């Protein structure tokens, strides 16, 4: 039992892993972006049981490095063009290492008071960038889903009671992230009472159809209580009409929550900050640091304009008076604080702006290309496009684009996935890697066009 907490075998394995991993960090370019697992790999894991007797440490570590951690998308590779695993700074890694070492937590007791002070300082700073100048509040959460549910609960407790909750209705767009409707169900709003407002050609929420749905629901006897606008859509990086939405909310006595899990980072970019004008109008906003603030999963934030709303929703005593929904938390904000102090907000701002440039470069490289359609132009480091030769009908065009995705993934040169946009299968690129160059974007596009016409000629008909 004296070798449970600490042993020399462990102390060595830790130092060895850190050393080895730092060394392998310098040969990321030589490695494929995405390594895929074979179909027998799952059973290989399921056949390792939870043993009664312990195993030698480095034997288990090697097993995890080879059989578990190996099969992933390296988000720290410049040509990993997805954003769900975000590029993770080693400053953030260091934050995790220290926080886990000291074994401390946020909230809960008062044994670690400075932990909460650190997090509070960050949340205050983030409040400034959003546009909350009055008396804001906030809490660190594990992700956007948790950020969304936290805000929507505050929204619900602020607008509805237990006897009219069944009459409450919520409003989102068809490009709104799925966690929002999911979170709405959890707090008591049925899917039948969650309106999916259509979007522009620019994928922004149609505020005209929004108001129509609001007046109709109000007339039916329902109680419209919240509109969720997205600042940085998952698919296209589009932004809902923030001022227009806020106007309707003030008019119809509705809570305005902005889902800025991805796009809220743009506030740190002096060049593109103006795109999120009116975030300070919202009553609450979500923000993930593991997306565009270069953190490891998971470090996300939710901010409210009036802190009294978080108290009314999440206080412990006397249940009628950060917090919520957790009591004791992992010290998530500590690694973000460390990142801010070491890198500074200017540098982080510059990195975000480089993300915009990468998408633009992808579009500029796609323009001369023949039969390449731009479904969504370069917007907030994102771009959606497809190879659509006139010869192939609708169905075989979608299959073509999917085959292109598989072809480049197997090549291990870049990570590009397919998303359904406007009814058609579309290739998507989200480039936010700080060290990605124009050559990276150019060659990738050139490699995509190559695969595009390779599979094109493979359509031997009939």
Ligand X SMILES: Cc1ncc(COP(=O)(O)O)c(C=O)c1O
Range 310-369, binding ligand X (CB under 6 A): 326-328
**Residue closer to its own copies, measured from CB, 277 or 345:** 345
Burial grade of 104 (CB within 10 A; 0-12, 13-18, 19 or more):
middle
Binding residue count for ligand X, defined by CB under 6 A: 16
Q: Which is nearer to ligand X, 291 or 407 (CB)?
A: 291
Q: Does 238 bind ligand X (CB under 6 A)?
A: no
Q: Which residue of 230, 269, 295, 339 would you call a contact of ligand X, by CB under 6 A?
A: 230
Segment contacting its own copies (CB under 8 A): 72-80, 202-210, 222-230, 399-407?
Answer: 72-80
Between the alpha carbon of residue 188 and those of residues 181, 196, 252, 296, 369, the distances in Å are: 11, 17, 21, 32, 50
- Whether the link from the prior residue into 462 is cis, omega within 30° of 0, is yes
Work out what residue 459 binds among its own copies, ligand X, none; the CB cut-off runs from 5 to 8 Å by kind. none
Cα distances (Å, whole numbers) of residue 207 to 147, 213, 229: 24, 10, 10
x-or-dash string of contact with its own copies, 126-155, rule CB under 8 A:
----------------xx-xx--x---x--
**Residue pair 198/265 in contact by the 8 Å Cβ criterion:** no
Q: Minimum CB separation from ligand X for residue 236, in Å?
A: 11
Please choose, out of 98-106, 212-220, 224-232, 364-372, the segment that lies near its own copies by the rule CB under 8 A.
98-106
Strand order in the sheet with 194-197: 137-141, 300-304, 284-288, 255-259, 223-230, 168-173, 194-197
Q: 3-state class of 379 per DSSP?
A: strand
Decide: is 406 part of the binding site for its own copies (CB under 8 A).
Answer: no
CB 83, min distance to ligand X, A: 7
List 27, 29, 54, 367, residue binding its own copies (CB under 8 A): 54
Contacted by 259, from ligand X, its own copies, none: CB < 5 to 8 Å by type = ligand X
- Round to whole Å and give the CA distance between 254 and 226: 5
Q: Which of residues 155-174 bind its own copies (CB under 8 A)?
A: 162-163, 165-166
Residue with the closest Cβ to ligand X? Answer: 144
Which partner from the list ligand X, its own copies, none does 182 bind, CB cut-off 5 to 8 Å by kind? its own copies
Q: Which is nearer to ligand X, 211 or 283 (CB)?
A: 283
Phi/psi of residue 149, each to 5°? -65, -35
Residue 165 burial by Cβ neighbours in a 10 Å radius (0-12, 13-18, 19+): middle
Q: Indicate whether 271 belongs to the interface with its own copies (CB under 8 A).
A: no
Cβ proximity of 104 and 117 under 8 Å: no
343 is an interface residue for its own copies by CB under 8 A:
yes
Question: Binding mask 209-228 vs its own copies (x if CB under 8 A, - otherwise)?
Answer: --------------------
287-316: which residues touch its own copies (CB under 8 A)? 294, 296-298, 313-314, 316
Nearest to 231 by CA among 195, 256, 209, 249: 256
Contacting range for ligand X; rule: CB under 6 A; set: 92-100, 116-124, 139-147, 275-283: 139-147
CB of 283 to its own copies, least distance (A): 18
Is the C-alpha dihedral spanning 124, 299, 15, 11 positive or negative?
positive
- Which value, in Å, is the radius of gyration of the alpha carbons in the chain? 24
State how far Cα 348 lies from the chain centre.
17
Burial (Cβ within 10 Å: 0-12, 13-18, ≥19) of residue 171: buried
Q: How far apart are the first and last CA of the chain?
A: 72
Contact 286, 147 (CB under 8 A): yes
Q: Which of residues 255-274 bind ligand X (CB under 6 A)?
A: 259, 261-262
Closer of 242 and 334 to its own copies (Cβ) = 334
Q: Which of 218, 277, 325, 399 binds its own copies (CB under 8 A)?
A: 325
Single residue of 34, 404, 408, 445 touching its own copies by CB under 8 A: 34
Other C-beta atoms lying within 10 Å of the C-beta of residue 229: 30
Per CB under 6 A, does 177 bind ligand X? yes
Binding mask 51-80 for ligand X (x = CB under 6 A): ------------------------------
Closest to 331 measured CA to CA, from 118, 87, 86 = 118
The single residue among 169, 179, 401, 418 that binds ligand X, judged by CB under 6 A, is: 179
Work out what residue 64 binds among ligand X, its own copies, none; the CB cut-off runs from 5 to 8 Å by kind. Answer: its own copies
Task: Restricting to residues 182-201, name those near its own copies by CB under 8 A.
Answer: 182-183, 185-188, 190-191
Report 140-169 residues binding ligand X (CB under 6 A).
143-145
Spatial distance between the Cα atoms of 341 and 357, rounded to a whole number of angstroms? 26
Given a contact cutoff of 8 angstroms between Cβ atoms, the answer to whether 242 and 277 are in contact is: yes
Using CB under 6 A as the criterion, which residues of the chain lie in contact with ligand X when the complex forms? 108, 143-145, 177, 179, 230, 232, 234, 259, 261-262, 288, 326-328
């Amino acid at each position: 039992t004296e070798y449970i907490l600490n042993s020399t075998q462990l102390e060595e394995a830790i130092k060895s892993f850190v050393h080895d991993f730092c060394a392998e960090k310098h040969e990321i370019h030589d490695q494929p972006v995405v390594v895929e697992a074979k179909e027998h790999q799952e059973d290989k894991i399921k056949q390792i049981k939870i043993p009664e007797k312990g195993r030698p440490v480095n034997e288990v570590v090697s097993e995890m490095m080879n059989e578990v951690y190996r099969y992933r998308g390296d988000a720290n590779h410049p040509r990993f063009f997805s954003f769900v695993p975000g590029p993770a700074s080693s400053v953030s890694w260091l934050g995790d290492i220290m926080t886990s070492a000291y074994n401390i937590h946020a909230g809960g007791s008062k044994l670690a008071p400075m932990v909460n002070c650190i997090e509070q300082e960050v949340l205050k700073w983030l409040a400034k960038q959003v546009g909350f100048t009055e008396n804001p509040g906030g809490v660190f959460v594990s992700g956007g889903s948790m950020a969304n549910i936290t805000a929507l609960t505050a929204a619900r407790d602020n607008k509805l009671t237990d006897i009219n909750l069944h009459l409450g209705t919520a409003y989102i767009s068809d490009q709104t992230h799925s966690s929002v409707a999911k979170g709405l169900r959890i707090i008591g709003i049925t899917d039948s009472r969650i309106r999916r407002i259509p979007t522009n050609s620019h994928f922004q929420m149609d505020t005209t159809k929004l108001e129509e749905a609001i007046e109709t629901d109000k007339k039916s006897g329902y109680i419209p209580f919240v509109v969720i606008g997205t600042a940085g859509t998952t698919n296209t990086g589009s932004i809902d009409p923030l001022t227009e939405i806020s106007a309707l909310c003030k008019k119809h006595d509705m809570w305005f929550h902005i889902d800025g899990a991805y796009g809220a980072s743009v506030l740190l970019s002096p060049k593109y900050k103006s795109l999120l004008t009116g975030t300070g109008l919202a009553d609450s906003i979500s923000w993930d640091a593991h997306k565009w603030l270069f953190q490891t999963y998971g470090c996300a934030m939710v901010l409210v304009k009036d802190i009294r709303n978080l108290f009314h929703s999440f206080h412990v005593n006397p249940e009628y008076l950060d917090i919520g929904m957790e009591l004791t938390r992992p010290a998530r904000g500590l690694k973000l604080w460390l990142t801010l102090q070491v890198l500074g907000s200017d540098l982080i701002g510059s990195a975000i702006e480089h993300g915009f440039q990468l998408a633009v470069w992808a579009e500029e490289a796609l323009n001369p290309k023949k039969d390449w359609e731009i479904v969504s132009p370069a917007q907030m480091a994102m771009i959606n496009f497809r190879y659509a030769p006139k010869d192939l009908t609708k169905e075989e065009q979608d299959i073509l684009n999917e085959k292109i995705s598989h072809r480049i993934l197997e090549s291990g040169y870049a990570a590009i996935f397919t998303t359904v946009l406007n009814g058609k299968t579309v290739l998507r690129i989200c480039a936010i890697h700080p060290e990605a160059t124009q050559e990276d974007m150019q060659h990738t596009i050139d490699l995509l066009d190559q695969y595009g016409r390779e599979i094109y000629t493979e359509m031997k008909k009939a």
